[PDB]
Amino acid sequence: ASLRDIKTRINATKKTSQITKAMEMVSTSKLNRAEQNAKSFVPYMEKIQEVVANVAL
Amino acid sequence: GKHVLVVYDDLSKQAAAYRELSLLLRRPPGREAYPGDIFYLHSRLLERAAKLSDAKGGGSLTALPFVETQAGDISAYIPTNVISITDGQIFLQSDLFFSGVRPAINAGLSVSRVGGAAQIKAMKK
């Protein structure tokens, strides 16, 4: 095709790639905190299960 | 005093014929092997279309030249020459043609420098 078309296509692909990279970075960042929130919540459910396994009677 | 509508079914073929004549007569070729005055040809052809004032009578002649583009590359020499001479341009696209738009006028690119003044009062609204 035309040189201008190819160059514009390359630039558009580059910008989309960079935006997707930023999105991957922010998604990983959000995971980095969701994991610790889940781990911190685990002992509460541990306690609730410990209590439940006496109330059954 | 009459009103005449003139349609040139293709100007690219005329340009190619002029290129053939100029090369055979051994004029020095320019870019894309065209002669230098290929712009002077089309410009002096198209400039004869106009509207006459009431002093010369109410005569009028409008022209609708045609240009065929290869793979939609408008930046080609002949398309760029012709586009810079006429008062307006209508771009027709095969992409729009196959999508279902039977008259394939690309409204985004089509322009008319004389529009509005031509349309009637109801249509202008």
Q: Does A3 touch chain B (CB under 8 A)?
A: no
Distance between CA atoms of B48 and B24, rounded to whole angstroms? 28
B75 is in an annotated binding site: no
B102 labelled as ligand-binding?
yes
Helix (H) or strand (E) run with residue B109 in it: none
Q: Which residues contact B10 (CB under 8 A, 6 or more apart)?
A: B66, B67, B68
Q: Which amino acid is at B39?
A: F
Q: Which residues of A touch B75 (CB under 8 A)?
A: 2, 4
Tokens of A20: 């997707």
Contact B11, B82 (CB under 8 A): yes
What are the phi and psi torsion angles at B37 (to 5°)? -85, 25
A14 φ, ψ to 5°? -60, -45
Q: Which residue of A has its CA nearest to B74?
A: A2
Residue with tokens 């190619």: B16
Q: CA B31, CA B35: separation in Å to the nearest integer?
A: 8
* Beta-strand relationship, B60-65 and B3-8: parallel
Name, in order, each residue with C-beta under 8 angstroms of B116's C-beta and a sequence gap of 6 or more.
B124
Pairwise CA distance, residues B119 & B114, whole Å? 9
Please indicate whether, in this complex, the C-beta atoms of B71 and A1 are within 8 angstroms of each other. Answer: yes
In whole angstroms, give the CA distance from residue B103 to residue B97.
7
Cα–Cα distances (Å) from A54 to A16, A35, A49, in that order, read 56, 30, 9
